[PDB]
């Protein structure tokens, strides 16, 4: 009845059990500090939208007015998102993307890359416990993905102990208790 | 059905010529019995 669209962000692979596949996915969990195999398949699916878009465009012709429009819009996203570097703007380059390029751009890594978090796991806990101001307002969610002008901007939230606020609750219990 | 194979006899079997005849006698009987009940 209600006019609300909805979609599925991921889908499971055809083979359940392959030692080639399970090993290479487990590295991506171990590097970037992920909860479960759905978080990989999300990005697996998200790439294949962008990849199948370029695969459709690249078959045609460089002077065709569909490709010059829809290509330049797609390349703007990859430059904005910090996914493809700006030195190469060819549509061909989008194909040479991998899942490691997307997973380095999410906020788990860009905290750690920043280095405030120290360790991949710690960085996820800092995000979820209401620290880390991205731009103007604070962000609670690991799978954010940063737009490259915004990346310098990540900093501890004004509120909170790292930030310069009330020291949570447990430090007060020690301080008032003593 | 069976068509061409009909009598392949790949493995120990009754023998098709005999089998066809046996079924004909069963069938012929079916007729007179079904006409008797008219």
């Amino acid at each position: 009845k209600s006019y609300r669209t909805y979609s599925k962000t991921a889908r499971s692979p055809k083979r359940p059990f392959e030692k080639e596949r399970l090993d290479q996915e487990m590295k991506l969990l171990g590097e970037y500090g992920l909860k479960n195999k759905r978080e990989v398949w999300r990005v697996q699916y998200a790439l294949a939208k962008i990849r199948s878009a370029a695969r459709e465009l690249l078959t045609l012709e460089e002077k065709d007015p569909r490709r010059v429009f829809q290509g330049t819009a797609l390349l703007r996203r990859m430059v904005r998102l910090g996914l493809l570097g700006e030195s190469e703007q060819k549509l061909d380059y989008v194909l040479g993307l991998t899942v490691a390029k997307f997973l380095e751009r999410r906020l788990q890594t860009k905290v750690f890359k920043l280095g405030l978090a120290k360790s991949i796991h710690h960085a996820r806990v800092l995000i979820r416990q209401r620290h880390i101001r991205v731009g103007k307002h604070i962000v609670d969610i690991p799978s954010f993905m940063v737009r490259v002008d915004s990346e310098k901007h990540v900093d501890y939230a004004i509120t909170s102990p790292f930030g310069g606020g009330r020291p949570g609750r447990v430090k007060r219990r020690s301080l008032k208790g003593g | 059905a069976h068509g061409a194979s009909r009598y392949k006899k790949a493995r120990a079997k009754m023998r098709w010529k005999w089998k066809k005849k046996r079924t004909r006698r069963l069938q012929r009987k079916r007729r007179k019995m079904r006409q008797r009940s008219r």
């Binding site: 487990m26 171990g30 479960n36 | -």
Partner: protein, 50 residues
């Protein structure tokens, strides 16, 4: 199959076997913390009995 197979022995081995309780042990980590442990102990068969 024959209908008159007897139903006397039904629940032999469930009733036969010796009962034994589960041991109390410290809980495993779950979710992300589980996948941390599985990552490390492989890269630094998996079940090898004596």
């Amino acid at each position: 199959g024959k209908v008159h197979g007897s139903l006397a022995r039904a629940g032999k081995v469930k009733n036969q076997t010796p009962k034994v309780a589960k041991k109390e042990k410290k809980k495993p980590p779950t979710g992300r913390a589980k996948k941390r442990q599985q990552f490390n102990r492989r890269f630094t068969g998996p079940n090898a009995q004596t």
